[PDB]
RNA sequence: CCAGAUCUUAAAGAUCAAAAGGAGCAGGUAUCAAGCACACCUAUAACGGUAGCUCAUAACGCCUUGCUCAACCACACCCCCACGGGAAACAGCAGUGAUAAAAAUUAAGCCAUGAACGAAAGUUUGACUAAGUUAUAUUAAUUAGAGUUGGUAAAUCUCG
């Protein structure tokens, strides 16, 4: 969300966000299925699946985006560009 | 690894786990396959599959390939006798050479335990030293043992600094 | 010929007895964790999977040994009396050669006395473990063998977890070895906490405790509210077996007596509680056959 | 390394740490260091006693008979600790020493005796 | 019983490379080594005389050398023992028959 | 693969293994691309004869360098070597000049291990043992000082 006030656009992409919303199914509710190598445009994301006891080493972004889905556990790699959005 | 056209059999692993050990009178192996045919193919995937697991495990063994010499695939083998084994591969599949092959001139899977059992026993459990050849390296480490005084300071009696201060005075 | 505990009879009866539970004898343990493997099966490998698990389960239930106490070695070997004030403390020396069984080794000992005398069984095994060390054992004696901790940790139901650490700790006719195992069996059968013991490897060690002791009451009566009579009446043809010359044992081959009927006569004939047993034996048969 | 003479024997290595004493019984070359380089480990030997009140030897007897029987040298020490072990007869200077304490001994019982008085 | 050579080479195959010295075969040995990084086979070649009795030997022929019990000089460790394949004239040692490489020059089917 | 030395014993063994070798692995540099006799036969050990051999899968050079560590390799004032010649030797322990950003005792014992010699009691050993010195590092407590506070990156107020 953009706008000239830092405030307006904090609520501008909350609201809007609540609009795109994805469903992740977590195996066992902790981890993710199996293991994932994505390339999105430049970025290369790579995700293992850990067991019960190994929380969370990933980027830090991908740390808080997980803690907000509910992916417990997890180990992520990116690669190539880091840039936020991609 | 990414590059090649089957790079699990560039891995340590796949390596390792192909199991063809030849006997000790195998000094030669020699592969004669085709390029073409259908018939040939077995002996194709042997070389491209197999033939980097036997090499790995027999590294002394000079393996060498001939390729659209004879209109039939074969192996022979060379032996320190003097002696020639020739196995005509033909319609044959990889895994039954394979499996030919360690019936012909393998070990015994008897064999190659007691092998490595002689291998185990040349490290003892008692002994002493560096990390690297055993368990434990002084006995300052053994539960009952008076323990290394680089950890628990020792009694002032047992140092040998007070005793020459006793005999002194 | 008196019945010992490797006999073919008992090891069936007690194998028998034990059960297989795939759920318990395969338990998550504590250790480290490495990520779950995934394989796609028809019915079939399926199948055949469940079954090398049960031969594997089979293994995992192999029975220790039980073995009545060893004898107390004393043995001089030489008597120097020169060699008297000589030294303060004792040598022990210990024959290390890979090659030779842990019960053929030779241990022998220098007193300040002078005698030579051969090790006791204690200094024994402490000195085999000093040399040929096996993962589980302390050289000095644990802890938790000492009657409170023990106490504590039957409260917490551990019995399995107290018997394998005395399975790794001592030797299996040792005297502390079967002081505890008996101890515990005590104490399971104090509390009527037999189950805990079920699909354990550790079923038929109480199952010949127990026989021996002659108390099989609270395993009869537990057997039989758990619902499995096949294995209450294999346990009183067990102790049949094990007393062929006493009056329940000889009633049964007057009576001639079916299962269900043998545990009737040994009701009657032996066991210290008839009351609970007749009892237990009437609500199981009239309940299940109204049931089913 | 290459060496002119020397012989096969058995020693004690000294490993341990300052005060705390500590040996490795070992089949080495006489010429090559105290510490260092061996063909074979023996046993060992802790000389300070435990809590039990006991000095540890441990001695590999098939080994130690292999190596004697191919002419290797016994040190005065491990012929004093086999020796205690009883797979030699005593040393002469075991039992020497012996008597010597035991007339060291008597000495001072009577000179105890005599500055009692 | 002693015949031996201090030779890890005991029997070797390989191409001849030149004949150019009298009685003496140059030959091209090539064994599999195994490239540590990529783990893969790659082949390194090494050259062996050979001592020829009867300079039997072309260029390009398949040749099998046993190690020579006493060098005959600091170069030549081996004696040419058998010629495995002629160049360009091939016996199949399957079938026993003429071959000019994929092709039988005489069928094996037609004896008479 | 072992000649030799040594130990034991008649021999056989065994320990250390020179010289000679080679399946494989082995610093940088290709602006070092050719080396220049570096091969083989004959046979008697020579006469003689073929014209080869190494190398872009790095020969031949140049630079840098102990090491893959129960250890190994090398050196022992210099001239790779040591007959000779410079010349008069701590790269044994301590010390000292010089030099460097670089700073341990001109110490005590053979009591233990090891080594040498002795038939032996034993003697010798700056190996070594026990000590001395040093915040270099760990640990234990008796010990509080240093750095930082725009962002990365924990943490600031008033003056100049
Ligand atoms: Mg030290
Ligand atoms: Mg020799
Ligand atoms: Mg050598
Ligand atoms: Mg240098
Ligand atoms: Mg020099
Ligand atoms: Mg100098
Ligand atoms: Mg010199
Ligand atoms: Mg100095
Ligand atoms: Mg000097
Ligand atoms: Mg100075
Ligand atoms: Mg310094
Ligand atoms: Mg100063
Ligand atoms: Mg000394
Ligand atoms: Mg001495
Ligand atoms: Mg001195
Ligand atoms: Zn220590």
Redesign the interface.
């Given at each position: 969300g953009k706008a000239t006030e830092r405030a307006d656009a904090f609520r501008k992409a909350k609201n809007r966000a609540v609009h795109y919303l994805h469903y992740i199914e977590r195996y066992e509710d902790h981890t993710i299925y199996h293991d994932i190598s994505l390339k999105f445009k430049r970025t290369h994301i790579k995700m293992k699946k850990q067991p019960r006891g190994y929380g969370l080493h990933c980027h830090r972004a991908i740390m808080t985006i997980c803690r907000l889905i509910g992916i417990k556990d997890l180990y992520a790699k990116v690669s190539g560009s880091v840039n936020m959005l991609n | 690894p990414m590059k090649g056209r089957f790079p699990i059999r560039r891995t340590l692993q796949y390596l390792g786990q192909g199991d063809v050990v030849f006997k000790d009178s195998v000094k030669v192996m020699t592969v004669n396959y085709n390029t073409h045919g259908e018939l040939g193919e077995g002996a194709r995937k042997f070389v491209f599959f197999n033939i980097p697991q036997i090499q790995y495990k027999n590294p002394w063994v000079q393996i060498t390939m001939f390729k659209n010499m004879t209109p039939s695939p074969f192996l022979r083998f060379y032996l320190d006798s003097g002696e020639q084994v020739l196995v005509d591969v033909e319609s044959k599949s990889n895994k039954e050479i394979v499996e030919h092959i360690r019936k012909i001139l393998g070990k015994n899977e008897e064999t190659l335990e007691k092998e490595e059992q002689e291998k185990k026993q040349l490290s003892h459990p008692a002994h002493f030293g560096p990390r690297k050849y055993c368990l434990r390296e002084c006995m300052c480490e053994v539960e009952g043992q008076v323990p290394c005084p680089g950890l628990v300071p020792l009694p002032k009696e047992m140092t040998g600094k007070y005793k020459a201060a006793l005999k002194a005075t | 010929r008196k019945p010992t505990f490797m006999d073919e009879e008992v090891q069936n009866i007690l194998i028998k007895m034990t059960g297989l539970d795939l759920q318990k004898i395969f338990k998550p343990a504590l250790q480290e964790?490495?990520?779950?493997t995934?394989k796609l099966m028809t019915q079939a490998q399926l199948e055949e999977a469940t079954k090398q698990a049960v031969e594997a389960a089979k293994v995992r239930l192999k029975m220790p040994p039980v073995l009545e106490e060893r004898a107390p070695i004393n043995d001089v070997?030489?008597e120097?009396k020169?060699?008297?004030?000589?030294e303060?403390?004792?040598?022990?020396?210990?024959?290390?050669?890979?090659?030779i069984p842990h019960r053929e080794r030779?241990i022998?000992?220098?007193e300040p006395s002078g005698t030579?005398r051969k090790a006791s069984w204690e200094?024994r095994d402490?000195?085999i473990q000093?040399?040929?060390?096996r993962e589980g054992r302390?050289?000095?004696t644990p802890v938790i063998f000492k009657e409170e901790n023990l106490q504590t940790m039957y409260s917490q139901d551990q019995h399995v977890d107290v018997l394998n650490l005395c399975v790794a700790q001592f030797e299996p006719d040792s005297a502390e070895y079967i002081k505890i195992h008996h101890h515990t069996y005590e104490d399971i059968d104090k509390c009527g906490k037999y189950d805990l013991l079920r699909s354990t490897r550790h079923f038929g060690g109480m199952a010949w405790y127990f026989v021996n002791k002659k108390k099989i009451d609270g395993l009869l009566i537990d057997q039989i509210q758990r619902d499995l009579v096949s294995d209450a009446t294999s346990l009183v043809h067990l102790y049949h077996i094990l007393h062929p010359d006493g009056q329940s044992a000889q009633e049964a081959k007057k009576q001639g007596a079916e299962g269900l009927h043998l545990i009737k006569v040994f009701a009657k004939t032996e066991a210290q509680k008839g009351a609970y047993i007749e009892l237990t034996l009437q609500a199981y048969q009239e309940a299940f056959i109204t049931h089913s | 390394r290459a060496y002119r003479g020397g012989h096969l024997t058995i020693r004690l290595a000294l490993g341990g740490c300052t005060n705390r004493p500590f040996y490795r019984i070992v089949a080495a070359h006489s010429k090559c260091p105290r510490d260092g380089r061996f063909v074979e480990q023996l046993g060992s030997y802790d000389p300070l006693p435990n809590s039990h009140g006991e000095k540890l030897v441990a001695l590999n007897f098939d080994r130690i008979r292999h190596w004697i029987g191919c002419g290797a040298h016994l040190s005065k020490p491990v012929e004093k600790l086999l020796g205690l072990s009883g797979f030699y007869p005593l040393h002469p200077m075991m039992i020497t020493n012996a008597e010597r304490l035991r007339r060291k001994r008597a000495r001072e019982v009577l000179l105890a005796s005599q500055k009692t008085d | 019983s002693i015949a031996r050579s201090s030779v890890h080479a005991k029997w070797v195959v390989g191409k001849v490379i030149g004949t150019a010295m009298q009685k003496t075969a140059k030959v091209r040995v090539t064994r599999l080594v195994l490239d540590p990084y990529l783990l893969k086979y790659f082949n390194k070649r090494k050259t062996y005389f050979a001592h020829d009795a009867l300079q039997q030997c072309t260029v390009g022929d398949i040749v099998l050398l046993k190690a020579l019990p006493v060098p005959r000089t600091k170069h030549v460790k081996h004696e040419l023992a058998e010629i495995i394949f002629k160049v360009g004239q091939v016996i199949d040692p399957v079938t026993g028959k003429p071959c000019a490489g994929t092709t039988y020059l005489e069928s094996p089917i037609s004896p008479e």
């Open positions: - | - | 964790l490495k990520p779950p995934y070997l030489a120097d020169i060699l008297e004030g000589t303060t403390a004792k040598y022990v020396f210990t024959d290390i050669s890979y090659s030779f022998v000992v220098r030579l200094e402490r000195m000093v040399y040929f060390p302390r050289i000095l | - | -």
